[PDB]
Design a binder for this molecule. Structure first.
Ligand SMILES: CC(=O)N[C@@H]1[C@@H](O)[C@H](O[C@@H]2O[C@H](CO)[C@@H](O)[C@H](O)[C@H]2NC(C)=O)[C@@H](CO)O[C@@H]1O
Ligand SMILES: *[C@@H]1O[C@H](CO)[C@@H](O[C@@H]2O[C@H](CO)[C@@H](O)[C@H](O)[C@H]2NC(C)=O)[C@H](O)[C@H]1NC(C)=O
Length: 362
């Protein structure tokens, strides 16, 4: 069972204990650690943060004492701009240049592979995206043909049905990718105007669901159906929750909201709270287990946050194993209690460790 974990380079700037650097990550926690994100300049894979190289080595040093730990560099991201990614992949020269620039850059900085995080292709890129993945793998195979350990190629894919239908040719790309991370969270935007868990396992009360597709179970199964081999499918689990600001005395699923929740003390972004920020939130709050969805939400005052915890991630791992999937993907290591100071127990990476334990269990 693969345990793909994401590290975001921008988590370094978070205030106080919030600040997170690769060297603060547990080398034995995950089987794969992905660095996010690498940029693309002049159609060449390139660093993004001024100190990426330094952090690259900081991350890759973890491989010294643990040879099995695999490492990947993720290119794309949210601030990339699907616009650019489209052109690059669309243009035949740009695509070639970029693909050819990857293997060198990776070996040069100590990475075991590349992770495509094009977020997200459009209806017009469905094929370009296929071509890209196909040719990128070709190159990796070539580059190692002489006898090296072949570079890994993975991709983070949307779990939203609309996007999967318009942008992905699951069957085709599943052949070339070594593994796919299905981003099964962010199912409920604060725009929907009602409270809702952003990462439910199942649909739950058929009566109160907005969508019939906005849940983990559906996405996993849909993808399996579309041709993605279970052995190549990694199910994403979030270590963060989506928040909302309540508009009335109603605090249950589907209650009225006036917008996203108050920003977290360390992540500073409305509608988001890192699990460790949640641990603080829980103090004096009330947790409700959402029957049917297998996930919890907590509410206190005029704040509402849907998230995952030991119990829910355990169920989710249970689910994926029962589905015979490649493993779990975590987003992100810097959002889990990596200090181990917030959720008490002094235990580090409570959610991630919980996931790791469940995977080895039984
Ligand atoms: C690429 C980008 O927009 N990221 C910003 C960072 O680069 C900023 O960090 C600061 O960047 C300068 C020049 O690259 C460094 O010399 C400086 O040491 C660095 N400061 C810190 C805190 O390490 C960052 C500042 O908030 O904002 C973006 O993340
Ligand atoms: C990633 O690469 C892109 C393109 O090479 C960079 O975008 C350029 O940014 C400069 C300054 O912000 C602009 O003058 C150019 O017009 C941009 N190019 C285009 C057309 O996108 C981007 O800054 C890079 N990102 C980082 C942080 O490295």
């Amino acid at each position: 069972y693969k345990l793909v974990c994401y590290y975001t380079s921008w988590s370094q700037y978070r205030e106080g204990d919030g600040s997170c650097f690769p060297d603060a990550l547990d080398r034995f926690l995950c089987t794969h650690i992905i660095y996010s994100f690498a940029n693309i300049s002049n159609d060449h894979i390139d660093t993004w943060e001024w100190n990426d190289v330094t952090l690259y080595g900081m991350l890759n040093t973890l491989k010294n004492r643990n040879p099995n730990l695999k490492t990947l560099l993720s290119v794309g991201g949210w601030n990339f701009g699907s616009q650019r990614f489209s052109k690059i992949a669309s243009n035949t020269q740009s695509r070639r240049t970029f693909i050819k620039s990857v293997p060198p850059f990776l070996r040069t900085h100590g990475f075991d592979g590349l992770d495509l995080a094009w977020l997200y292709p459009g209806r017009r890129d469905k094929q370009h995206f296929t071509t890209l993945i196909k040719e990128m793998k070709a190159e990796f195979i070539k580059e190692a043909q002489p006898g090296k350990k072949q570079l890994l190629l993975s991709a983070a894919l949307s779990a939203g049905k609309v996007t999967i239908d318009s942008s992905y040719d699951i069957a085709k790309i599943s052949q070339h990718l070594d593994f796919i991370s299905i981003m099964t969270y962010d199912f409920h935007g604060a725009w929907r105007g009602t409270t809702g868990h952003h990462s439910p396992l199942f649909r739950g009360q058929e009566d109160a669901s907005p969508d019939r597709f906005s849940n983990t179970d559906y996405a996993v199964g849909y993808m399996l159906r579309l041709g993605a081999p279970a052995s190549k499918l990694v199910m994403g689990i979030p270590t963060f929750g989506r928040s909302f600001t309540l508009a009335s005395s109603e605090t249950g699923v589907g209650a009225p909201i006036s917008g996203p929740g108050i920003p977290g003390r360390f992540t500073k972004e409305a509608g988001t709270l890192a699990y460790y920020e949640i641990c603080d939130f829980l103090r004096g709050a009330t947790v409700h287990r959402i029957l049917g969805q297998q996930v919890p939400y907590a509410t206190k005052g005029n704040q509402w946050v849907g998230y995952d915890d030991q119990e829910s991630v355990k169920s989710k791992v249970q689910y994926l194993k029962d589905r015979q999937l490649a493993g779990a993907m975590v987003w992100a290591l810097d959002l889990d209690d990596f200090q181990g100071s917030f959720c008490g127990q002094d235990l580090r990476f409570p959610l991630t460790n919980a996931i790791k334990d469940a995977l080895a269990a039984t």
